Structures are given as C-alpha cells and as structure tokens.
Scaffold this active site. Structure first.
Site, PDB file in Angstrom:
ATOM      1  N   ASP A  35       4.374  37.553 -35.481  1.00 17.85           N
ATOM      2  CA  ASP A  35       4.107  37.234 -34.233  1.00 17.85           C
ATOM      3  C   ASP A  35       2.683  37.144 -33.760  1.00 17.85           C
ATOM      4  O   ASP A  35       1.810  37.873 -33.373  1.00 17.85           O
ATOM      5  CB  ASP A  35       4.777  38.271 -33.131  1.00 17.85           C
ATOM      6  CG  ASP A  35       4.836  38.255 -31.632  1.00 17.85           C
ATOM      7  OD1 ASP A  35       4.507  37.003 -31.456  1.00 17.85           O
ATOM      8  OD2 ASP A  35       4.762  39.166 -31.043  1.00 17.85           O
ATOM      9  N   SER A 199      -3.393  22.194 -23.718  1.00 23.31           N
ATOM     10  CA  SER A 199      -2.885  20.897 -24.273  1.00 23.31           C
ATOM     11  C   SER A 199      -3.239  20.014 -23.200  1.00 23.31           C
ATOM     12  O   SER A 199      -3.629  19.915 -21.949  1.00 23.31           O
ATOM     13  CB  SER A 199      -1.278  21.022 -24.127  1.00 23.31           C
ATOM     14  OG  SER A 199      -0.569  19.813 -24.428  1.00 23.31           O
TER      15      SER A 199
END
Length: 330
Positions: A35, A199
């Site tokens: 994770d 992004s």
C-alpha cells in the site's frame, strides 16, 4: 541488493493485490497488500481477536526465533474506506522477493474491522508511503522500503500491476524490459506523507486533451481512480445511461455499455487507461447495473490515482533524497 516479488489480484475484479512476504525464522509466509498510501506493516497474528479471524494466515511471533517484542509500542490506523486495525509491535526479519530487512517493525493486530475479517485473502498490509505517516507510538517506525533503502542498488521500488493478471513489485532496480518507450519523471511532495504529484491533464476516449493540474496521490492500496467531480462528470457523460447513484455510492453504468478509455498526463507524456479497466462489474450479483472505476474525489479531500490508473503504467517510486515518481506505458 534487490528484491522482486509477484503480486496477484485477490479476485476477478482486481479489487486489491497480494504479494507474499516472509516474516520470522523459520519463515512464515503471509500474503500482504502493498500500500503506497500508508506506512504501517501490520499482520493478522496469534494475538488477533479470534472472532475477527476468518481464513487469514496469521503471524505467530512466539514461533519465530528472531521476533522481539517492541516493549510499550502500540499502533492504531484508520483507512480512507473507514476500515481500521490496531495492536502491539514486534521486530523481526522480513523478506520480500529475496530482499531481507532485519529489525523490521511488524505490527501485530489485536483488533481488525469487519472489512478485513471478511477478506480471507489479505493477511495484512505492507505500507510504502513515507515513514512520517507510521502510526506506532511512542516511537514511530520505518517502512520496509525505508529500512531497505541504504542496502538497495538504487533507492527505488517499482509497481507493475496487472489487469486481471499478476504483476510485479521490484526493489532496488528498474527492469528496462518491463515497459515501452521512456519513463517520464515528475515531482513529488512529501508534505502529507504520500507519493503526491500533479498530473498535467486528461482526455476522455478519443477526445481532445484538457490541460489542467490535478494534484493527487499514487496509491496502490486504493482500488479505483478518484478525481475531481468536473473530470468524472466529463468521463461518464460519454457513456449512455451512466449516472451517479447516491444509493449505490457512486457512478454506475449499464452493463451493456462499451466504456471509453481515459488518458491522464504525466508531464508531456500520456498514460491511457483502456475502457475495460474502468468496469467493476455488476453492483450486486445478477444486476445489469455496473459499478464505475472512475469516481469523484469530492469529500475525500484528495485525488487518488489508485489501481485503475496505476495498472495502466509501469510506475517508479524514486526514494532518492528528493523523491520523484516515474510513469511509463507498457
């Protein structure tokens, strides 16, 4: 040193991925959920409340000659999906794919929430976010990666998740045969303890690319792609009959649909998520309403590039002094 381990979807939907991990001496192999959005290595154990164990493999520290109680240390964690676990702490030898760390903090669960009990395939979590998020008190502990880092050939790990198929976690090296083209690296902020990056935009299907900054985290422990409501609405508007259902808890779409791809920007590069990756199947057995793999982050407080996005790429988690993230097509 290096390590390399195969990671395998837990079910037919790629709801999560498990990777075998050797703990203790002799080795006890548990299948852990790696994770990159958390920083605790915790396991089902001989200390876990019996009624909360249902099929998981447990770590038994009393059977490990290298286990030592970390006296006074406790831990307690809550995840974004509302699940939780807590317990005490041992140090022991932990190996992943041939890479060994001695003195790793292994957090033994005394209690786990129902979602963990109900998932027989996940024996614990191995956190790969920054150690500043580790929950051990009163002495915070380091992640497996942080402990391994100095010994690694290069201070990196890579995630290469499969779509409906196994993939690979590598430590200490970049497998140049595992991706196509070049890797595009992008800046990371560690201010919130995550692999947080920005992004450069998105496209829906064959549509034009929208240049827009989307701050979010690369999180292998989250199944879906969670993005701003504007972006998500633009995606689902291209699917006939798709709608947001408050009763179901997100966007659903007719199972008869063919889903468009979704592209996200990494600098000047582009990662394309095929439409099929966005299908999470019937909302309930036999239903013709299917659950979407792109969902709104509104009210999570953060955008999450979870497995839906990451499995479309070869992803480099660069833990050099100034960390960065790399993405390549594959």
């Amino acid at each position: 040193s290096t390590g390399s381990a195969t990671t395998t979807p837990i079910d037919s939907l790629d709801d999560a991925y498990i990777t075998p991990v050797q703990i203790g001496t002799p080795a006890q192999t548990l299948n852990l959920d790696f994770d990159t959005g958390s920083s605790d290595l915790w396991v089902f154990s001989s200390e876990t409340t019996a009624s909360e164990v249902d099929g998981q493999t447990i770590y038994t520290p009393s059977k490990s000659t290298t286990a030592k109680l970390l006296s006074g240390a406790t831990w307690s964690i809550s995840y974004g999906d509302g699940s939780s676990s807590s317990g005490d702490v041992y140090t022991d030898t932990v190996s992943v794919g041939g890479l060994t760390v001695t003195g790793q903090a292994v957090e033994s669960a005394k209690k786990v929430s129902s979602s963990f009990t109900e998932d027989s395939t996940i024996d614990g979590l191995l956190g790969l976010a920054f150690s500043t998020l580790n929950t051990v008190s009163p002495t915070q502990q380091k992640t497996f990666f942080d402990n391994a880092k100095a010994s690694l050939d290069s201070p990196v790990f890579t995630a290469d998740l499969g779509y409906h198929a196994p993939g690979t976690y590598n430590f200490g090296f970049i497998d140049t045969t595992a991706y196509t083209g070049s890797i595009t690296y992008t800046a990371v902020s560690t201010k919130q303890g995550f692999w947080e990056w920005t992004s450069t935009g998105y496209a829906v299907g064959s549509g034009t690319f929208k240049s827009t900054s989307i701050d979010g985290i690369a999180d292998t422990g989250t199944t879906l792609l969670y993005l701003p409501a504007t972006v998500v609405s633009a995606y689902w508007a291209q699917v006939s009959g798709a709608k947001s259902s408050s009763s179901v808890g997100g966007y659903v779409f007719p199972c008869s649909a063919t889903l468009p791809s979704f592209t996200f920007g990494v600098g000047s590069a582009r990662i394309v998520i095929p439409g099929d990756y966005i299908d999470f199947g019937p909302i309930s057995t036999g239903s013709s309403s299917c659950f979407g793999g792109i969902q709104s982050s509104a009210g999570i407080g953060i955008n999450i590039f979870g497995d839906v996005a990451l499995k479309a790429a070869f992803v480099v988690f660069n833990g050099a002094t100034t960390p960065t993230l790399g993405f390549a097509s594959k």
